[PDB]
């Protein structure tokens, strides 16, 4: 079987939905772990060295800071667009502070379903190229999978468009939902910008509190993977409740709610549409 390596559980789950049991799949960043600044273990080094095909997010998720993915593919003698592929190729990139320069791409593309569809298309393309015997199987699965994501995308856009505009604001700790905001027409507000060193300072908290007091947003949200003390403080200082915990960097453990890219996004979209209609 084709030996495939995915850098994280989101990419691995999309790959499973396209390839099923036709491949030997290894995921580096485990469920619930941080896909930025991760430290690969010897098993990840060995599996990457043996892989036929490697999938990574790109757009600086795994190549910024410690550049753990760059070190991994360099030590494995794997070549870009031959052995390893960025599944984000083709997304309409967002840049930090709206400044279009290499290195300023915002990595959080999968938080809108159109980009999850692009990820899937890139995965199906490269699986079909490396394993042409299963090309028809991968294309059938790609069509079924992207139909499922597209239906969820259309339903959620219809729900957000109904929400009174004065309520439509997605508030999270990190500014990680800019792709979500662009796709769904829901502006973002947050405590700290992407790549901030000190997360949840008194200055950051005070700044968001002052912004939110001038809005009618009825609910705040908090990422399940972050320390919730900064958002709890914002919630108490603004008197706006935290409606739900939401997924950002990972799917959930198998058997739990949100244990796939689709179910993670359905959970987020359901909780945010519900919370903002309050
Ligand atoms: Mn992030």
mmCIF file of C-alpha atoms in Angstrom, residues 28-30 33-45 62 64-69 71-72:
data_model
loop_
_atom_site.group_PDB
_atom_site.id
_atom_site.type_symbol
_atom_site.label_atom_id
_atom_site.label_comp_id
_atom_site.label_asym_id
_atom_site.label_seq_id
_atom_site.Cartn_x
_atom_site.Cartn_y
_atom_site.Cartn_z
ATOM 1 C CA UNK A 28 2.521 13.368 13.124
ATOM 2 C CA UNK A 29 0.779 15.936 15.423
ATOM 3 C CA UNK A 30 -1.577 13.949 17.660
ATOM 4 C CA UNK A 33 -1.757 18.818 20.173
ATOM 5 C CA UNK A 34 -0.420 22.033 18.719
ATOM 6 C CA UNK A 35 0.499 21.784 15.023
ATOM 7 C CA UNK A 36 2.708 24.920 15.225
ATOM 8 C CA UNK A 37 6.036 24.523 17.194
ATOM 9 C CA UNK A 38 5.526 20.672 17.668
ATOM 10 C CA UNK A 39 8.607 18.479 18.252
ATOM 11 C CA UNK A 40 8.591 15.316 16.044
ATOM 12 C CA UNK A 41 9.550 12.039 17.701
ATOM 13 C CA UNK A 42 11.748 9.270 16.286
ATOM 14 C CA UNK A 43 8.698 7.408 14.908
ATOM 15 C CA UNK A 44 7.726 10.526 12.910
ATOM 16 C CA UNK A 45 11.250 10.784 11.489
ATOM 17 C CA UNK A 62 4.553 23.940 10.390
ATOM 18 C CA UNK A 64 7.429 29.015 11.115
ATOM 19 C CA UNK A 65 9.347 29.287 14.386
ATOM 20 C CA UNK A 66 11.208 26.002 14.968
ATOM 21 C CA UNK A 67 10.320 25.040 11.305
ATOM 22 C CA UNK A 68 9.874 21.470 12.432
ATOM 23 C CA UNK A 69 8.405 20.297 9.077
ATOM 24 C CA UNK A 71 13.856 20.056 9.271
ATOM 25 C CA UNK A 72 11.897 16.783 8.883
#
